[PDB]
Symmetry: C4
Subunit: 244 residues, 4 copies
């Protein structure tokens, strides 16, 4: 088992790729669709040109990136790339408490780096037109519902993480592909309701870049901390109850 110093840097490089490519697709969708007829308020540009196919596109950007990361770095850090996962796994005694805060920091640092680097790669348009793919409720969606859809979202994620990754009886090698594809699915449905974050670090990244680029959104941050965690811890604890 690799030194914590190396699992930290593994968690950085992982969450960096999560936030570079995942929310990077959301930006590029918005940027190439910018100008097209948005036929109602609920449609904010994503879906304008490719309908829900735009959301699957985006979900798959996320999924296949997430999968890549697990398959390359999972053996090293565990490939958490998400604080809700770390917190959920800790709440079952599958992760050391001493390492939860160090992991989450590694995730946040990685997320900020991915968001900032994407911004540099594309130009200011990435934020002013793409929002750096930051998550926030959609037209006609309150905070109440926003956390609930984020909890129901991250509940299904963690449930798969238990079933195909943590459980001794899980078929080896499927983990990365399954976990990622699952996220990809969740984004397709949940995307146009809350931006399907499922992940505090993945929300943080853009929020920083945006508020660095003049666009302050931290009002909505709790939705992406409370929602994901209550979903993940719920999933983790339910799993164990059902499987013993």
């Amino acid at each position: 088992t690799m030194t914590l110093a190396k699992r930290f840097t593994a968690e950085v490089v992982g969450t960096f790729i999560l936030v570079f490519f995942g929310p990077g697709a959301a930006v590029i969708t918005l940027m190439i669709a910018n100008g097209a007829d948005k036929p109602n308020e609920f449609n904010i540009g994503i879906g304008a040109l490719g309908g829900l196919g735009d959301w699957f596109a985006i979900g798959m950007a996320f999924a296949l990136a997430i999968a890549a990361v697990i398959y390359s770095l999972g053996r090293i850090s565990g490939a958490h790339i998400n604080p809700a996962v770390t917190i959920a796994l800790w709440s079952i005694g599958r992760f050391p408490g001493r390492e939860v805060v160090p992991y989450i920091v590694a995730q946040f640092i990685g997320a900020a780096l991915g968001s900032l680097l994407f911004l540099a790669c594309v130009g200011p348009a990435a934020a002013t037109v793409g929002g750096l793919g930051a998550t926030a409720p959609f037209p006609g969606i309150g905070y109440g519902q926003a956390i609930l859809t984020e909890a129901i979202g991250t509940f299904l994620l963690m449930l798969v993480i238990m079933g195909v990754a943590v459980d001794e009886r899980a078929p080896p090698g499927f983990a990365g592909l399954v976990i990622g594809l699952t996220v990809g699915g969740i984004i397709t449905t949940i995307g146009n309701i809350t931006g399907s974050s499922l992940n505090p670090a993945r929300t943080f990244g853009p929020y920083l870049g945006d508020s660095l680029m003049g666009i302050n959104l931290w009002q909505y941050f709790p939705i992406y901390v409370i929602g994901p965690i209550v979903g993940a811890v719920a999933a983790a604890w339910l799993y164990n109850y059902l499987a013993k």
Copy 2:
């Protein structure tokens, strides 16, 4: 194995996710596409912006969710999340008769919960504009053809379920992924003909929420009971005849 009480609650939580995310994509497609030019009668808003890609998006929302459920819960309840499967497996003596009615109830309860919760998450728009993703025949499609396409649909599903899940010679671990992706495929073709239900619990959920939200559609329910069961039992029995 796990107590029936726990396989029940496993079947609820499974069918819940099946109906939350699967038909939830259908709703969100319709909602974001609401207002766009529907260039003929046959196009009812799905396909309006993203063409058949909208249907594949939707199918994948389903497929990846279904897969997630099998990989997480299949080890517990069997992950039937569908009464036609349960009835088909019983008709081969692979499932105890004592448990078919308890399973189907668990499925229906889970389906109503997933439909209701999605509704709460989004708002009334989810029903009045999205129809809660309920299945029903498409423009120029009679009841005769609607049960036949639903049979031909659920026939291919069950056939895979025999071939990659029930059969002792099936390559282990591929189950969840293959079965889900297969559904995904069916929806892509059959979607704009009957809404590709393949599943009485998956049709029931929306139908309840809709008729709770003022939109009564139970006229069409037999198409999604008869069609799927005749398809599933036909597949199960054909499989065994061919494989011995």
Copy 3:
């Protein structure tokens, strides 16, 4: 459980039926739902009109996931050839009995006609008059010369995968169905708007029958979907062996 030929025949019918019901069935539904939308040039015939190339990947995936489903359920029984070019290619390497090539191809053709006809019944005449029963034929500005070459280059990559992940002893077990299907899905996405990406005489036949039954005669183009696929498959099979041996 090496099942009787009678049962591998009926397995090959039920397999090629699902291949032609769902595969070309997506192509029809694409056309039908997109019917009326602005086709911004000649090369766009309605597929791509609403969902761009995403419409072609949608269609390719309808094919791929159906093909995959078949292999994983019936492969253990008939071999899940569901394609005469495959049977002929495998025979040309002595991996399939000559006595069973003609019986296999007939099973495939019967299954393909049944899938095409059943889809037609399911939807209505619109399925043919508007959807063309998803029959393959060259696209605007594509000659017969190029149409067979793109169909050979197409089915060459298919058969090459079939060798590598299904026929070869050293292939990782269980991946076969998924990989072979997804591969087809890939080929359709690129080749689709050039020839309809048939890769398969039985898959072309099905629609052609239904169409010519519904008044739309297209057999002029059938050789493109017999010659092209076979020359591609037999080439792939024979190249594979040359590369992988002694």
Copy 4:
């Protein structure tokens, strides 16, 4: 191992299929979308009809082709079909130096063949309208950023190649599928920034056909040599540091 003569001809036939089908999708997208409303400068026709779904479509054309090639030919040549990979693997002492130049030549020859054959298959339209799918920066993207996005791109690729192919502990059989799907993912995000080449041979092919068809673009070639290599070598070396 098979003789080098046969691994050469294996690398030709592989990179041929990479460039025929991969960039072949890009051409067909452009050709069928030719004429449609491009609602801003950043949208050059890809995305016009199917939004980002057009980019995922293209990425999957690539991914599934790449996967096919590894699964069929990887056993023979290693299925590099990419000079940056060969050069990266050499830099770790996993590939013989004597074979790096021969491999790269095989790749280039195979790429030129695939590009030329596609051109022949379709007609001049393939170049004059499709650009033979050649990669080049997008509107508002400088050379500085173009190499950085291509490095960040090919960095993720090689990182997966280490994790699921080179590493002794990698789950067997997942290689082809995972590596290809990963590329597919990268193209979806990076596509509309640089054309997501990740690969000198894959850029070369089109560039030749194009400059044969009157369209000279070699001004941009360094972006697709420097970018990919620096990304691949960085990834390879980082991996080993993290995994020992």
